Design an enzyme around this catalytic site. Structure first.
Site, PDB file in Angstrom:
ATOM      1  N   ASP B 146      17.121  44.446   9.042  1.00 41.16           N
ATOM      2  CA  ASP B 146      18.204  43.464   9.106  1.00 41.16           C
ATOM      3  C   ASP B 146      18.253  42.607   7.840  1.00 41.16           C
ATOM      4  OD1 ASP B 146      20.425  42.099  10.179  1.00 41.16           O
ATOM      5  OD2 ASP B 146      19.265  41.064  11.687  1.00 41.16           O
ATOM      6  N   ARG B 150      22.001  36.077   5.137  1.00 42.62           N
ATOM      7  CA  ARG B 150      21.734  35.159   6.264  1.00 42.62           C
ATOM      8  C   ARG B 150      20.260  35.184   6.752  1.00 42.62           C
ATOM      9  NH1 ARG B 150      24.502  39.420   8.254  1.00 42.62           N
ATOM     10  NH2 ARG B 150      23.104  40.853   9.362  1.00 42.62           N
ATOM     11  N   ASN B 151      19.491  36.214   6.387  1.00 40.76           N
ATOM     12  CA  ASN B 151      18.090  36.422   6.849  1.00 40.76           C
ATOM     13  C   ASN B 151      17.074  36.228   5.733  1.00 40.76           C
ATOM     14  OD1 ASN B 151      19.034  39.073   9.232  1.00 40.76           O
ATOM     15  ND2 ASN B 151      18.909  36.855   9.399  1.00 40.76           N
ATOM     16  N   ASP B 164      13.458  36.436   9.676  1.00 38.57           N
ATOM     17  CA  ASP B 164      14.163  37.090  10.798  1.00 38.57           C
ATOM     18  C   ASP B 164      13.677  38.511  11.033  1.00 38.57           C
ATOM     19  OD1 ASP B 164      16.066  34.849   9.581  1.00 38.57           O
ATOM     20  OD2 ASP B 164      16.881  35.113  11.574  1.00 38.57           O
TER      21      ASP B 164
END
Ligand SMILES: Nc1ncnc2c1ncn2[C@@H]1O[C@H](CO)[C@H]2OP(=O)(O)O[C@H]21
Ligand SMILES: Nc1ncnc2c1ncn2[C@@H]1O[C@H](CO)[C@H]2OP(=O)(O)O[C@H]21
Lengths: 277, 284
Positions: B146, B150-151, B164
């Site tokens: 992932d 955003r991570n 994350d």
């Protein structure tokens, strides 16, 4: 893989709706798999003028499992027709984002409808009516060999005339992402889903109805529920709840699925309560 | 409930909600006497929401199980867990600038902006730090799965921290992770063989890294802008890729395109990506 096959099938007449006849409106919220908006549909299913509908679509950061859920909802709802199951009207698969077009429920989710209520003003009679209507739709689904899996007050919609509509078929399976607190003990420990685990979730829903939108197992972390259920703990009789109603709930949460009522027994019990009251 | 990690619940104090990630909510917190450090230490805490499902519990446990085993300057640090007498909580390093996506998007409105002052040199540095963390994770036989702006978190000193780990998986047995069921990574960051064939390897992390590269040079732009996620099946199979963004050199774009080769063995490995980024830095 399985999704790429379903997507391609979907994008390649009874259900296809012309995109030009659909006017998207107000956002209603976000569901199990995407976003829901109010809309008007011109000449939907041979109806005159504009029909108010709800439209389901994906968010841009959708995952394969979210897209799989949308197409799954479409494929299940095509097979279904019952007054207390939300109706599918069609889909737009040929012009931009995939859209599902469904019956609009003007009051939104049962959960919000109840939480904004006091015992509008609702009587126990209303509440039993609501439970019965859901149990009818569930009997119908169980007869069709569909397991809903995600029965909860947030997944029941309230339409004109306060008619219950079972909704949110993204997780349903033609016989996990279901919140722990609505799941049957065998679903938690063994990962099994049957009509009888739908009956368990129905009992949690009954509890939600009777508490007018309460939060199940309050103050209990879902991670600690597995062990509490296995040792035989269940939610206690809530404040404004009869002995017979609570007996009904408790039986939905029997450890052995065979000792739970079926939806016909659940409908029978509420028909009896209604007339006797 | 691991003695190397278990932390006294009474020594932890929870504050404001920072947001919701892949499996739960993240809250700002403070921990007293954390790992022998005197006084309070500001930390982030991961926890489940009340309507949590079994997969979200399993993702929380996966993050714990991965972070227990890794230590790198560019991977977010695990400090402990509270797993008794209440909700399960993971205690992790606090990153004061939040996600990379957020930090970059703020750089569009918050001066000095992209020239809080950021040059292409800074962007290359950020990408290199992440590539170093990923090279190490790949060595540890993990796939993140992932990877996305955003991570990635931005900690004190603007240091990148890969974050994350809810969807991260072990590949120590077979060098691939394969699931029968559908994945929970956003379609737009997924490698083509992950999307069609459900196969995840270090080389599908490379593909996602290429999408992260594009996010970085566009200062937090949205991948495949204007394209519905379901269209990616056809679009990728027919050989289309994102266009060279305006802020991007030819060399940097060639690296993104190498990350998105249809054949996974034609993509660079993270060691080579780090090298390409080092070469770019030094030549200005
Ligand atoms: N057919 C529908 N008609 C009206 N509202 C809907 C429909 N399906 C879903 N919603 C609303 O979308 C939200 C996420 O599911 C939820 O918030 P609500 O407005 O309480 O009713 C739901
Ligand atoms: N270790 C951490 N330190 C600070 N913020 C964090 C941390 N882990 C996650 N977040 C933030 O939680 C939010 C949901 O993922 C998201 O918003 P943000 O502040 O941009 O950074 C992320």
């Amino acid at each position: 893989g399985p999704l790429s096959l379903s997507v391609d099938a979907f994008k390649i007449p009874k259900w296809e709706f012309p995109r030009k006849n659909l006017v998207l409106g107000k956002t209603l919220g976000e569901g199990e798999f995407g976003k829901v908006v109010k809309a008007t549909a011109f000449h939907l299913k041979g109806r005159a003028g504009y029909t108010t509908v709800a439209v389901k679509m994906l968010k841009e950061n959708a995952s394969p499992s979210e897209l799989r859920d949308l197409l799954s909802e479409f494929n299940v709802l095509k097979q279904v027709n019952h007054p207390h199951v939300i109706k599918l009207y069609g889909a737009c698969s040929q012009d931009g984002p995939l859209l599902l077009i469904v019956e609009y429920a003007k009051y939104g989710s049962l959960r919000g409808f109840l939480r904004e209520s006091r015992k509008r003003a609702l009587t126990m009679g209303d509440l039993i009516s609501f439970a019965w209507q859901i149990s009818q739709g569930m009997q119908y689904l169980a007869e069709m060999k569909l397991v809903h899996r995600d029965l909860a007050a947030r997944n029941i919609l309230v339409a004109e005339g306060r008619k219950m509509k079972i909704s949110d078929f993204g997780l349903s399976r033609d016989v996990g992402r279901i919140p722990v607190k609505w799941m049957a003990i065998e679903s938690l420990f063994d990962h099994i889903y049957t009509t009888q685990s739908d009956v368990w979730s129905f009992g949690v829903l009954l509890w939600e109805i009777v508490t007018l939108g309460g939060n199940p197992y309050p103050g209990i972390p879902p991670e600690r529920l597995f062990n509490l259920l296995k040792t035989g703990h269940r939610m206690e009789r809530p404040d404004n709840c009869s002995e017979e109603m609570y007996r009904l709930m408790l039986q939905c949460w029997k450890q052995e699925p065979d000792k739970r009522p079926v939806f016909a027994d659940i409908s029978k019990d509420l028909e009896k309560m209604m007339v006797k009251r």
